[PDB]
């Protein structure tokens, strides 16, 4: 599909290291394989929001800010604006706080020509308490709102199938990573297997060969 | 109660401005009235995490990082660690992602001798979709885990009495403001009516008068 983003090799690097030197080094090594890097609070709080501009200027990669935005609408607006001003191409937002909080993010994205990803579900043990039960409704809330980009877990492939069912084949979906993840998701997110590898470039290359 | 924090005059400043000069100026002006300042991502993402150390060194105020932490346990750990390293006395965490994500924050707080506040409920319109229905259970989850500090809304006083009922009289509870708020909460949080006032110092003093 043409109106959703193109992620090189369907593989997104989760750059979860907290040290700038380490983060830049690994990312540089895999740039021939990956053009989209997901950055979280661990790195930006440790090293500064300026690191986003650094990734983009050094490597020309797309940056997804995995900030799991989860505040009231006014605060969400401010967070999204500060994040997009720093250069992020996209931001990941929680749906649990409801439609107004999501729309606040969509508004700033509209103003600044950036993207919003709705996080529908998480896969860590405690997610079963509240998140899993809300996930389908959060996905539908996104769809009813024209959200185009989603994040789903890939510890349960069949959940991805339900999610893909709700958001349609048109929507852009990314999920952690693998063969059956990519049967549902447009791109897989990979972290440790790359950034902790003795040879990250080889690790990335290896994963892509599997993706065939 | 002695094992819960003392907030000067039961009044917490919500420092929601995004530029460092304005933020420091207002906070300085109210330091005679307020010793506890809540700061959020809008300010720290715009100006850097170093601003926390600045508030503390300049004014000797307690800093609560309103980061609404809402990630998986490992990432929550890293977020709390970076935040406490930067000097925050306390951090606010979402309960919706479940007990393991909260406990991760409690672990780092235990290691570093800092505090965790559990956010039980929000009051913005979209909260009715998912958060309000989960609020009592999130509060009970906090209690079952010995969380001692809580954040609750103050747009519905009766919700505060429900929350106070669940967490007990021993727990520390903070909520937006203030007269009816302080029947239930230990301290009220105030933002705009102080930081946008032509005379913040007078605004603060004015509010404290009404609290007697």
Please, could you describe this protein's structure?
The structure is a homodimer of 212-residue chains. Chain A is α/β, with parallel strands linked by helices and 212 residues long. Chain A has a single domain, classed as Aldolase class I (TIM Barrel, Alpha-Beta Barrel). Chain A is 47% helix and 19% strand. Chain A is built from 9 helices and 8 strands. In chain A, strands 1-2-3-4-5-6-7-8 form an 8-stranded parallel β-barrel, surrounded by 6 helices. In chain A, helix 1 links the parallel strand 1 and strand 2. The longest helix of chain A has 18 residues. Chains A and B meet through helix 2, helix 4, helix 5 and helix 6 of A and helix 2, helix 4, helix 5 and helix 6 of B. Chains A, B: It catalyses: orotidine 5'-phosphate + H(+) = UMP + CO2. Chains A, B: It comes from Methanothermobacter thermautotrophicus (strain ATCC 29096 / DSM 1053 / JCM 10044 / NBRC 100330 / Delta H) (Methanobacterium thermoautotrophicum). Chains A, B: Pfam families: OMPdecase (PF00215).
């Amino acid at each position: 599909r043409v109106d959703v983003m193109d992620v090189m090799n369907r593989l997104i690097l989760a750059m979860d290291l907290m040290n700038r030197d380490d983060a830049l080094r690994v990312t540089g090594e895999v740039r021939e394989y990956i053009d989209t890097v997901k950055i979280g609070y661990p790195l930006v709080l440790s090293e500064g929001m300026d690191i986003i501009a650094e990734f983009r200027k050094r490597f020309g990669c797309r940056i997804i800010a995995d900030f799991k935005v989860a505040d009231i609408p006014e605060t969400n607006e401010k967070i999204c604006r500060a994040t997009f001003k720093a250069g992020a191409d996209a931001i990941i937002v929680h749906g649990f706080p409801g439609a107004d909080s999501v729309r606040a993010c969509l508004n700033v994205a509209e103003e600044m020509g950036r993207e919003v990803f709705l996080l529908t579900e998480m896969s860590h043990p405690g997610a079963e308490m509240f998140i899993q039960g809300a996930a389908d409704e959060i996905a539908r809330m996104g769809v009813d709102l024209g959200v185009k980009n989603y994040v789903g877990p890939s510890t349960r492939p069949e959940r991805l199938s339900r999610l893909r069912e709700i958001i349609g084949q048109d929507s852009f979906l990314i999920s952690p990573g693998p063969g059956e993840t990519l049967r549902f998701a447009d791109a897989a997110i990979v972290g440790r297997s790359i950034y902790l590898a003795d040879n990250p470039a080889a690790a990335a290359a290896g994963i892509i060969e599997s993706i065939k």
